[PDB]
A paper describes a structure:
RecQ helicases, a family of DNA unwinding enzymes that are conserved from bacteria to mammals, play a key role in protecting the genome against deleterious changes (for recent reviews). BLM acts preferentially on recombination and repair intermediates containing HJs to promote efficient branch migration.
The structures of human BLM RQC complexed with a phosphate ion and an arsenate ion were determined at resolutions of 2.7 and 2.9 Å, respectively. The asymmetric unit of each crystal contains two RQC monomers (Mol-A and -B), which are bridged to each other by the ion (P1 or As1) shared at the interface. Since the BLM RQC domain binds to DNA in solution, we predicted that the phosphate ion P1 in the crystal structure might mimic one of the phosphate groups in the DNA substrate. As schematically represented in Figure 2c, P1 is bound by Mol-A and -B through nearly identical interactions, even though the two molecules are crystallographically independent of each other. The side chains of Ser1121 in both Mol-A and -B form hydrogen bonds with P1, while Arg1139 only in Mol-A forms a salt bridge with the ion; in Mol-B, Arg1139 is less close to P1 (5.3 Å), and instead a main-chain nitrogen of Lys1122 ligates the ion. Interestingly, the position of P1 strikingly overlaps with one of the backbone phosphates of the 3′-strand DNA (yellow).
Residue numbers in the entry: 1074 to 1194
The structure:
């Protein structure tokens, strides 16, 4: 139904912005600890105030129900636009963090439009 392309473009650009220290010579990489769980991304997107980061795509999702914002991310993973590997902290917990998938660069080149079906409940 609703076209969610410009949002995916920026969600993608965002995710990758918080992956390296672009600029400084040593293009240092972030994560696994400096990576976002799908919820942290949903919280950031949905302008939540528990958002770890409150810039970039911080206010974007203000027109999405929390339910739908989640499904939009569940989908972006499903579509390999965003992917998630696992992290294991010292307390021996397995945490799933999000990263870009082989299809993200596509959406960035407009070569791929994304569509989303808004759901209730």
């Amino acid at each position: 139904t609703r076209d969610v392309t410009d949002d995916v473009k920026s969600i993608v650009r965002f995710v990758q912005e918080h992956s390296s220290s672009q600029g400084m010579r040593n293009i240092k990489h972030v994560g696994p600890s400096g990576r976002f769980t799908m919820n942290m991304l949903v919280d950031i997107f949905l302008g939540s105030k528990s958002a770890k980061i409150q810039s970039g795509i911080f206010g974007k999702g203000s027109a999405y129900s929390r339910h739908n914002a989640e499904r939009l991310f569940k989908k972006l993973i499903l579509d390999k636009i965003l992917d998630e590997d696992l992290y294991i902290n010292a307390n021996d917990q397995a945490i799933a963090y999000v990263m870009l998938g082989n299809k993200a660069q596509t959406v960035l080149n407009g070569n791929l439009k994304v569509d989303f079906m808004e759901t209730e409940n």
